[PDB]
Design a protein around this ligand. Structure first.
Ligand SMILES: C[NH+](C)c1cc(NC(=O)CNC(C)(C)C)c(O)c2c1C[C@H]1C[C@H]3[C@H]([NH+](C)C)C(O)=C(C(N)=O)C(=O)[C@@]3(O)C(O)=C1C2=O
Ligand SMILES: [Mg+2]
Ligand SMILES: [Mg+2]
Ligand SMILES: [Mg+2]
Ligand SMILES: [Mg+2]
Ligand SMILES: [Mg+2]
Ligand SMILES: [Mg+2]
Ligand SMILES: [Mg+2]
Ligand SMILES: [Mg+2]
Ligand SMILES: [Mg+2]
Length: 226
RNA sequence: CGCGAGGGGAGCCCUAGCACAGGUGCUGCAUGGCCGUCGUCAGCUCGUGCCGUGAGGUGUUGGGUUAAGUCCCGCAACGAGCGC
């Protein structure tokens, strides 16, 4: 499906961030300062949204596995129910320095979760002395917390998808190294040369987030028939 | 072995000689092992990654908690080995 100027506005996509927390390189992308706090030119989001949906549509036509990254406390459970719909892997909880330049060292920890789900199915768990029982219990949920999106990541992703290229300019800097392409949603407080496929729009607007994912995760499934 | 007096042989015994035995002679500052001790103190480290040109750091630190590196939260870390 398609998208217009009309729809983006109501979301708060022109609604940039401050001038006091501000990245100069973000130049090209603005209108002005109606009350000191910037206004994004959406006739230059129509530019970097076309191109940055084409690139997503190709990847769902050559069936790509796209990471989802949002840790900003509003983002999270919208990263979530917008990756789940997509069939995806998502880091909603808290990124780990490694999870890309160390996928092994990390992924020795998935299997330790997948082993522990199955350990808890069987009866042999109850046999272990109940000190370990509650103890080794704790470790189950720890892993379900910070990974219930990582699990379905069995290898390294074809593109990572950020909502804040400055909070997780960590993540972005991993897929920098291991030549993955980057797909970011960025306001003004964010270096925009550190992204190949980029959306200028709101960082923290729980309705700007909301439209953009739920319109991305369409030109995923539509491009994977369904 | 022999019919036989009795010679040969193994053991052990003595005398003489030789291998050598034996030493609580030395050095714990040439060692083994075992012991004491800082100390039953919560500490000591490695892997992969991250960060510095590097020695190195990160991890193990900060805040909360614990008889404890015990654990909870945070963090460029994630776990494991010897301790608890
Ligand atoms: C006197 N100094 C030159 C000395 C010499 C030797 N060894 C030699 O000279 C042997 N060298 C050869 C190899 C034979 C040429 C030594 O072997 C020693 C010492 C130092 C002592 C000191 C001792 C001391 N108290 C118990 C008398 C002491 O307070 C301690 C301590 N740190 O608490 C010791 O270490 C001590 O007992 C000690 O070990 C010494 C020597 O071993
Ligand atoms: Mg000594
Ligand atoms: Mg002495
Ligand atoms: Mg001495
Ligand atoms: Mg103790
Ligand atoms: Mg280096
Ligand atoms: Mg930790
Ligand atoms: Mg230490
Ligand atoms: Mg520190
Ligand atoms: Mg421990």
């Amino acid at each position: 499906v398609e998208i217009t100027v009309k729809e983006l506005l109501e979301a708060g996509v022109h609604f940039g961030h401050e001038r006091k927390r501000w990245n100069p390189k973000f130049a090209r992308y603005i209108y002005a300062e109606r009350n000191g706090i910037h206004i994004i030119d959406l006739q230059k989001t129509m530019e970097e949204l076309e191109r940055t949906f084409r690139f997503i549509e190709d990847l769902a036509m050559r069936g790509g596995t796209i990471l989802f990254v949002g840790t900003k406390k509003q983002a999270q459970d919208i990263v979530r129910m917008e990756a789940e719909r997509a069939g995806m892997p998502y880091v909603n909880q808290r990124w780990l320095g490694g999870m890309l330049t160390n996928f092994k060292t990390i992924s020795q920890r998935v299997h330790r979760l997948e082993e522990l789900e199955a350990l808890f199915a069987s009866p042999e768990i109850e046999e272990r002395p109940k000190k370990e029982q509650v103890r080794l219990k704790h470790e189950l949920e720890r892993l379900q917390k910070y990974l219930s999106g990582f699990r379905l990541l069995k290898r390294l992703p074809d593109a990572i998808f950020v909502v804040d290229p400055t909070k997780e300019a960590i993540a972005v800097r991993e897929a920098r190294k291991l030549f993955i392409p980057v797909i970011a949603l960025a306001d003004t407080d964010s270096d925009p040369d550190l992204v190949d496929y980029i959306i200028p729009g709101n960082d923290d607007a729980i309705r700007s987030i909301q439209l953009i994912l739920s319109r991305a995760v369409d030109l995923i499934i539509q491009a994977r028939g369904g």
